Every structure is written in C-alpha cells, then in structure tokens.
Design a binder for this molecule. Structure first.
Ligand code: MNR
Length: 152
C-alpha cells in the first residue's frame, strides 16, 4: 500500500485537480482519445468527435470528465479502503462498457501527463511517485475484479 506520507502527497496533488475538475477531466479524456483513438470507439456518445477541436468544444465531454474525476477523487480520498467504491466501477467497466485494463493504464498515464502539463514545475518527483502508486493501486484492484469476472 501507500504510506501515510504518500497518501498525504496524493491528496495534496488532488487539490490541484479539485480547483478545476472539468478542465482536468476534459484534458485527461482528450489526451486519452488523441493518443489512443481505439478508446474513443468505446464511447457511442463520443464517436462523432472526429477532431481534437470538436473534442475541446464538446460540453458533454467536459461533463463526462467531471463524472470521471469525481469518481476517482472519491476513491482516492478513501486511501486504499475503497472496496465499496471500486467494485461497482470494476464491474460496470468489465461487463457493460467492455474496457480492457490496458485502457485504464492509458488513462493513468494521461493523468500524470495532464498534471505535468497544467502544473509544470509544480508536480515534484515525490508527488509523481505518490500519485503513480495510488493510480497503480486503483488499476491493480480493478484488475483483481476483472480476473474474478474472466474479463480480458
Ligand atoms: C477507454 C474508455 C474507458 C476508461 C479508460 C474509463 C476510465 C474510467 C475511470 C478511471 C480513472 C473512472 C474513475 C471512470 C468512471 C466512470 N466511467 Mn469510465 N472511468 N466509462 C466509459 C469508458 C471508460 N472509462 C464508458 C464507455 C462509460 C459510459 C459512457 C456513457 O455515458 O455513454 C463510462 C462511465 C463511467 C461512469 C458512469 C457510471 C458507470 O457507468 O459506471 C463513471 C463514474
């Protein structure tokens, strides 16, 4: 797990996200979609978005970004005690949305990129280490649920 110090770093970084949840959410999804276009195909509501301009101009994409990061923030603030919060997410993503764990790796990487991009020089080595651990933990706990379900 993460140490108390590490959790404190994670939630300190998360302060940045909470000052502009929609802006961070939007940039994360744009980073995901642009770098990994196959991921767009998992969203019937975003498949029409043929350019990054269209993405940036989509109010509904920003709205979804807010839903996404609010859910992740809820999870993070549990500091690893997130079984109740994580289980239904794991299950909807495997069973309904059919999201391979690879795409969760992609979005983890996107969050790290976006934090650097929006806060250059203000996302230190220790912070990146802590946030990365927290995201791997999220990812790994989801992967356990995927295995249970036999979802690939
Ligand atoms: C590559 C694609 C996917 C990735 C990566 C991804 C990563 C993440 C993620 C990681 C930080 C969090 C937190 C996250 C959280 C959500 N997510 Mn998710 N998600 N996610 C979807 C694709 C993806 N998610 C799709 C598709 C829906 C349904 C969208 C619609 O309303 O049409 C959805 C829906 C949701 C919903 C709405 C409730 C539900 O359906 O369970 C939440 C909350």
């Amino acid at each position: 797990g993460l140490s108390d110090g590490e959790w404190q770093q994670v939630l300190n970084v998360w302060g940045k996200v909470e000052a502009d949840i929609a802006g961070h959410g939007q940039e994360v999804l744009i980073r995901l979609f642009t770098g990994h276009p196959e991921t767009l195909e998992k969203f019937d509501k975003f498949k029409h978005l043929k350019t990054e301009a269209e993405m940036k101009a989509s109010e509904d994409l920003k709205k979804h970004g807010t839903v996404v990061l609010t859910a992740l923030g809820g999870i993070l603030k549990k500091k690893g005690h997130h079984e109740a919060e994580l289980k239904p997410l794991a299950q909807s993503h495997a069973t309904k949305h059919k999201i391979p764990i690879k795409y969760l790796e992609f979005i983890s990487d996107a969050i790290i990129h976006v934090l650097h991009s929006k806060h250059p020089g203000d996302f230190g080595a220790d912070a990146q280490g802590a946030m990365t651990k927290a995201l791997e933990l999220f990812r790994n706990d989801i992967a356990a649920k995927y295995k249970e379900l036999g979802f690939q």
